[PDB]
Amino acid sequence: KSRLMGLEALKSHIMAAKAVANTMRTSLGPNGLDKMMVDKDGDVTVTNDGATILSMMDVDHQIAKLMVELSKSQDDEIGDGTTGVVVLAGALLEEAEQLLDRGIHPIRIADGYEQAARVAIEHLDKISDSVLVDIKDTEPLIQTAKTTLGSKVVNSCHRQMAEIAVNAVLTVADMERRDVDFELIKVEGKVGGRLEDTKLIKGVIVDKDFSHPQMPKKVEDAKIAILTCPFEPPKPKTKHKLDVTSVEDYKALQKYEKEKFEEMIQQIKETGANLAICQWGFDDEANHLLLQNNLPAVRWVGGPEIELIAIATGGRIVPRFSELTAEKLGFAGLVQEISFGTTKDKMLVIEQCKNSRAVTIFIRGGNKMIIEEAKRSLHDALCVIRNLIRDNRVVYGGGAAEISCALAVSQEADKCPTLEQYAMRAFADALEVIPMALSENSGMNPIQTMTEVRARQVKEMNPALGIDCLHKGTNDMKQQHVIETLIGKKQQISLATQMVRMILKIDDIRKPGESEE
Amino acid sequence: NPIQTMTEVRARQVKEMNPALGIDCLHKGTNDMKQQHVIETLIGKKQQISLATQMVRMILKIDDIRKPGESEE
Amino acid sequence: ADEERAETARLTSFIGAIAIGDLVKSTLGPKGMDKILLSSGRDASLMVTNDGATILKNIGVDNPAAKVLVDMSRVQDDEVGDGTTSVTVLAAELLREAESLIAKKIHPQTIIAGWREATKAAREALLSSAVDHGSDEVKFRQDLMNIAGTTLSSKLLTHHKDHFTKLAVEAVLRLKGSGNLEAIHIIKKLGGSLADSYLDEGFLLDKKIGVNQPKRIENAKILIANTGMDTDKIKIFGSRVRVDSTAKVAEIEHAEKEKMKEKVERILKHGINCFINRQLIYNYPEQLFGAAGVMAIEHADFAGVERLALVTGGEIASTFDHPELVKLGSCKLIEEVMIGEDKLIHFSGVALGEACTIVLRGATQQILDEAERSLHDALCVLAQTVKDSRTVYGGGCSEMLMAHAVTQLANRTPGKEAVAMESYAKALRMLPTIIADNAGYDSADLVAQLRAAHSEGNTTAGLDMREGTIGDMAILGITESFQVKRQVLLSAAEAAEVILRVDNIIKA
Amino acid sequence: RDKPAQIRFSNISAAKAVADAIRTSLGPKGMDKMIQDGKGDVTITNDGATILKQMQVLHPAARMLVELSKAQDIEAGDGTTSVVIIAGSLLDSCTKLLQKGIHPTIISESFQKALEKGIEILTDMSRPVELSDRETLLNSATTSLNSKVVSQYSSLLSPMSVNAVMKVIDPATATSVDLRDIKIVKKLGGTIDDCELVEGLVLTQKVSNSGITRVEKAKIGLIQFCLSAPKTDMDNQIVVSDYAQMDRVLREERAYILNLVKQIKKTGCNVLLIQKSILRDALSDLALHFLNKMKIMVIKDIEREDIEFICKTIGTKPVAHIDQFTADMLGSAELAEEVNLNGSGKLLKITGCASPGKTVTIVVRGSNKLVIEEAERSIHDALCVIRCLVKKRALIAGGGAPEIELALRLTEYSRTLSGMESYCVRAFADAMEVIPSTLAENAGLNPISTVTELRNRHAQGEKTAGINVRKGGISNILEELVVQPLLVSVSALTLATETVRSILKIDDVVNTR
């Protein structure tokens, strides 16, 4: 194989770094123009989302490696911020060429990017120190879910989504805990609904319902019998499923399998519950018996969901039918089979007003692209919202923060006479590329457009108002309500600024060429 | 359109012959030879009839195309 | 992954719908030209296609941008009807419009609202010459009739047009508040009739009567059966395998012939002379069922008695085991109607009721296929003509009016995007242009004049590009429900601005 | 795009290239072909009429001419070339109009104009014939049979042609009396004179031996079952692991069918049409012996059309299983006959069969195949040329001549129409005259003599008269003893007319996914 060093590597790193910053820059923000992306499979994905673009790209290099990696630490915690962290890393790398071309060693600038990465996140700190409680922040949660639902263009009237993300974060992730819960938030949805068909389910919706509507739709508080046990074909994991191969076998199994389920569905109710959640469902034969034995219960519960309805409800674990006991049961504040407004989306909810250990946002949509349109949008909302419901620290987005940063950055950059005097100043120059590439997408000349904000910063020297991010012509950060959590913007940088510098410290690469990923 | 224009005074020949009307060579709204007041000397067109088939016959006349390698000066 | 940057992406955005649009813009518009599908990737074939999807889907759509419209234009056709050829050309128009504006170095975003807002005010100007024709039922008749004949047009239909413009409106004038595809029962076969079709009294069914069965059934009370017999009747003992060797292989066929006989026990219990079921029986079975003396009809169609039960007022049900799990159907006759050489067992309980059977007799399926869609398309445009009885002037006259207004608008409306609105307005008059030379006529004057001419208020007077003439859109009958035209405006305007805003395409 | 423009030209390229050499028509002209095929297959080819259908071409534009070939023949039976060769005349005008700049739709619509104006004149010239009387039936058969294989055997085949249609003849004139009703059954043995037009349903059914269903009250049945037996329909409890186990089930199979064929014999039906549908294989190979043992004609899985001929013509339907005897929906035949001419040949005749005033059956007979052929094809067009008269009566000429008469007189319509199409029809109007020129074209050297005069002569003979390609010389072409029914060319006109505008209806070629 081969070892490429210095300028070779220098042209190995920024090269693969430069192009993917470009696909996202015309994808950048709400005006970022979406990208249809098609697999070898005949697939089609219209993506302005970098992480989705990165999920769409298997493209090959340590950069393309780190890129698919870098955004998705921003996309879960903070959500929105996925796009800027990469494109700006390229812009930083875009600079380091000319800046090493000035004869400043890549590690001579390297600290200067991070050194001046301080002022930006430090300047972000200055923007809005506000932190609001759930019931107060819920408007800023949806006011940010104005923006953080905005980029996917599923936002207004989706204040449903915006509000269901308010409680979904609060329900499981506390405000004081500030340990991220996207794991105990259950992201859920189904095709055939509608974007405006939207709900936050507090407990667990199990997809299948009671074996009949001829038995009540409603199981009361708790009494959920947690069951791994066949009332339909078991398909056990220890042996293999086979069915009856003989004529006398359909005779006896029909007669045998009925009276046991008669006994067992009674034995469930003997052990007791108004709901038996079975990993292995009721058959249609066992359905009429759940009717005949006069018990409500769920037929099908997921193999994992038998843990879910156990944990997510806090319901005390009943492993199986043989472990059935009265004191151990799955729990509910109530149990319903809920039509969501489109009977196509129909679930049996085990709902938690007692303890929700998995809170379920249930989105709906005409199809899957539309619910995912909502969900990743709801995600980034739910993300920033959770960030904000932890600490409501916000910042006016669209770069007017960075336009205010870059000036203060490059100034405070010059203060250290060390060669990063200049190098940190060039760092600030990169802070201006995202609203730039946004102003491109906005239909505006970013050059003049930023200088409007520059002038506005010359006016303000912090973002309050700003330029367009959505394309309107009312140029505001505050009144347009272009606002991001103050956290993730700093996290964008922290993710954006070092990877460059980290790639700066690693130019020594054994490769025949870039494509090794 | 020439094809279109032809079809009209064509249809006119079904209507009318040797007509005081015709196409508009002046690119007018009226297509005539009279409201156009376009004309030639009945000499001229007849004199013009003379020449066309005169070269047609003329490229025929002899059997002799034989040249030094020069049929043009 | 293959990264497609904007240079070819916008370009590929343009080529996809244009390269198919040219094919359908022949078919679409008025008729000076069509698509003759010359078919070989799959076969040796020669086809004549006015259908967009038959042009779209048969040919390789593999362009990721062509994927959009071939997917999106079909739905528009699958929704309101005749949207394949529409959403394709109209966005392909915009692709040309974008291309210049692209080549003019203009933000696609700047082009978005420029078209997208222009889409509205055009749909608004579309709503202007949209003229409600619901006045009387005779108006609503001839509205639907003009509209039914509107979607059928620019397509090859032999005897179809004049009969369904009766039927489609017939299906409408019975349901009153919608049209009936739930009622019209399309029955296709080989009858030797060219396109010739008719409203079928009751519903005919195709079987040869023979063996011992007398062919005609009189005073027939049908016993509705949702479950018949295939060959062996299915119940507890219904299956056996005795085969230990090659003799039993031939001897197992003989064992199941017994199972045909026990089927008689079930039907003889019900007692009704006429037993009509879903599942067919064969001629050797006909021996056992016909000698039983009761008349057991095989393959009696669900939608057929669904016709009856609706019109006869009775109940067609599901899950038939014993006679009363479905309310007994009442027909006047179970008869055999002989159409040419055909023998068709024909159930007549009612005539031309609010559920009709429609017998489609043709020697070719493709015409019967494209006849169904244009019927499937019209009734939808007729069912929305039940809702919106505005029939907006078609044949490009709508394009003109919208092109004139939006141009007038772009003049004042933006300070910049007057680029795209007129560009939008330009794409409007496009669809008119391609077909006038197809009559030989000059679109330029037309789109210049007749637009402004009828956008100065001749709006009824409009484009006959079959004759290449200026004629009345209402009187020529060239016009259609305000929805479908706006509906074919919705997707195509949306179809273009998607790949317009697409500046990169990943390819795995 | 350029592709839309070139492909119609590329269509006009491959298509028009084919339809032209498609005229050597008639004549002893041009050297015979041993055609190595597109796959390398050596084939000796002659007589363009069949060489039409024979032709293997590629591309959409070339095959529509085979499609065009197929069209005229089945329609009339006459003028197989007449429909195609004029597609050479069509695409003449087409390009020149596309070279004139005329629009495809106008060139398309130009096809309909000349067509209407053409069917005008061809009927104007054509001299009406009576399709009821034996006379022009014989005469149109005559000239056709004079252009068919046997001129000598055109004699007896003529009443067998004339009576065949007159069997199926419909009141006065109408387009009817198809060749499907006619069942042409090749009978080995006999001669062409021995070819026999039979009034009733005759079958091509060929079963074992003779005396088999020669009897009286021999009905011809259709059975959509077949007979039973253990190891036929009824069960076997015994299984064969052993040749001895094989024997007792076949013995019990044979013994039971022997009773069933009695029940077919007592049915009055001495021909069952045994379903090609196979139950066990249905009718046993052990059974065929037994049905034939009762003088009942069944060959294993009887030829399906015979099943439909008995359905169509006779009205026979299946019956109950022979175990039940028969419901006797088997149609009414008091005679079904196996005729051996010269003591040879298998022909099932159903006499006394139900026939619906139609299904006349010519039995084309001969000791050779060629003998049957020379008869069979000749009578066919004689059947056709009379079917032609019945369908559309009178007569025009033959060999393309009267089309030049149309061509002269159509240019006059091309004079009147006063449109672009008046020129377009005109660009086509005289493009018709290429046929007799190209008919006489292919035989030789020092070429140019007769060709323009093959056109010029007719216009000299003016509007009534022209040269007769078959007998030579100028006259009224419609009767030199040169005729085809007025149907044949007006049938030839529209088809090629139709098919060519499709090329213009082509915006651009494609290829399916």
UniProtKB/Swiss-Prot annotation, chain A:
The keyword Hydrolase applies. GO terms for cellular component: cell body; centrosome; chaperonin-containing T-complex; cytosol; extracellular exosome; microtubule. Gene3D superfamilies: GroEL, GroEL-like equatorial domain, TCP-1-like chaperonin intermediate domain. SUPFAM superfamilies: GroEL apical domain-like, GroEL equatorial domain-like, GroEL-intermediate domain like. Its EC number is 3.6.1.-. InterPro entries: Chap_CCT_epsi, Chaperone_TCP-1, Chaperonin_TCP-1_CS, Cpn60/GroEL/TCP-1, GroEL-like_apical_dom_sf, GROEL-like_equatorial_sf, TCP-1-like_intermed_sf, TCP-1_chaperonin. Induction: Down-regulated in response to enterovirus 71 (EV71) infection (at protein level). Ubiquitinated by the DCX(DCAF12) complex specifically recognizes the diglutamate (Glu-Glu) at the C-terminus, leading to its degradation. Keywords: Acetylation, ATP-binding, Chaperone, Cytoplasm, Cytoskeleton, Disease variant, Hydrolase, Isopeptide bond, Neuropathy, Nucleotide-binding, Phosphoprotein, Ubl conjugation. One of its GO terms (biological process) is protein stabilization. Signal peptide: none annotated. It comes from the Eukaryota. It catalyses: ATP + H2O = ADP + phosphate + H(+). This is T-complex protein 1 subunit epsilon. It comes from Homo sapiens (Human). The lineage of its organism: Eukaryota, Metazoa, Chordata, Craniata, Vertebrata. The gene is CCT5.
UniProtKB/Swiss-Prot annotation, chain C:
ADP binds at G29, G83, T84, T85, S86, S153, S154, G395, E480, K485. It comes from the Eukaryota. GO terms for biological process: binding of sperm to zona pellucida; chaperone mediated protein folding independent of cofactor; chaperone-mediated protein complex assembly; chaperone-mediated protein folding; positive regulation of protein localization to Cajal body; positive regulation of telomerase RNA localization to Cajal body; positive regulation of telomere maintenance via telomerase; protein folding. It is found in: Cytoplasm. One of its GO terms (cellular component) is extracellular region. The modification Phosphoserine is found at S45, S245. NCBIfam families: chap_CCT_beta (TIGR02341), thermosome_beta (NF041083). This is T-complex protein 1 subunit beta. It comes from Homo sapiens (Human). The gene is CCT2.
From Swiss-Prot, chain D:
Keywords: Acetylation, ATP-binding, Cell projection, Chaperone, Cytoplasm, Cytoskeleton, Hydrolase, Methylation, Nucleotide-binding, Phosphoprotein. One of its GO terms (cellular component) is melanosome. GO terms for biological process: binding of sperm to zona pellucida; chaperone mediated protein folding independent of cofactor; chaperone-mediated protein folding; positive regulation of protein localization to Cajal body; positive regulation of telomerase RNA localization to Cajal body; positive regulation of telomere maintenance via telomerase; protein folding; protein stabilization. SUPFAM superfamilies: GroEL apical domain-like, GroEL equatorial domain-like, GroEL-intermediate domain like. One of its GO terms (molecular function) is RNA binding. It catalyses: ATP + H2O = ADP + phosphate + H(+). Mg(2+) binds at D78. The modification Phosphoserine is found at S10, S158, S176, S418. Gene3D superfamilies: GroEL, GroEL-like equatorial domain, TCP-1-like chaperonin intermediate domain. Its EC number is 3.6.1.-. CDD domains: TCP1_delta. Component of the chaperonin-containing T-complex (TRiC), a hexadecamer composed of two identical back-to-back stacked rings enclosing a protein folding chamber. Each ring is made up of eight different subunits: TCP1/CCT1, CCT2, CCT3, CCT4, CCT5, CCT6A/CCT6, CCT7, CCT8. Interacts with PACRG. Interacts with DNAAF4. Interacts with DLEC1. PANTHER family: CHAPERONIN (PTHR11353). Belongs to the TCP-1 chaperonin family. It is linked to De novo genetic variants in nearly every subunit of the TRiC complex, including CCT4, have been found in individuals with a broad spectrum of brain malformations, and clinical phenotypes ranging from mild to severe epilepsy, developmental delay, intellectual disability, ataxia, and other features of cerebral malfunction. NCBIfam families: chap_CCT_delta, thermosome_alpha, thermosome_beta. This is T-complex protein 1 subunit delta. The gene is CCT4.
